[PDB]
Design a protein around this ligand. Structure first.
Ligand SMILES: COc1nc2ccccc2nc1CCC(=O)O
Ligand SMILES: [Zn+2]
Ligand SMILES: [Zn+2]
Ligand SMILES: [Zn+2]
Length: 100
């Protein structure tokens, strides 16, 4: 199971009123594959198995927590773990409505 809390949930920012687009491509390479959205600034970048742009974004922003547009899991780069908590329910559900 994921961690039930982490000390970076404080950095999760309010969801844009535009909502989320789970088909949004990577902001850097344009791939449609394995994208994640950053839960601090809501930019979308690809996962480590494509071109690793979300990991790069973490490195040059320090933003902690990212949501997968594949399965709606949330990863913390600092804790190196999946996290789930009530603070993540609204953004997961917006993503779920857009995806399914
Ligand atoms: C299981 O998810 C990850 N494990 C990682 C391990 C080491 C380094 C980065 C990692 N990033 C993710 C998920 C987000 C991503 O793919 O960028
Ligand atoms: Zn990319
Ligand atoms: Zn960010
Ligand atoms: Zn964390």
């Amino acid at each position: 199971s994921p961690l039930p809390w982490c000390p970076h949930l404080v950095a999760v920012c309010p969801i844009p009123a535009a909502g989320l687009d789970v088909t949004q491509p990577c902001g850097d390479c344009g791939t449609i594959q394995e994208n994640w959205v950053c839960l601090s600034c809501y930019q979308v970048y690809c996962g480590r198995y494509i071109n690793g742009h979300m990991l790069q974004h973490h490195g040059n922003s320090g933003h902690p927590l990212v949501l997968s547009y594949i399965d709606l899991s949330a990863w913390c780069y600092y804790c190196q773990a999946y996290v789930h908590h009530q603070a993540l329910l609204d953004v997961k559900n917006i993503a779920h409505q857009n995806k399914f």
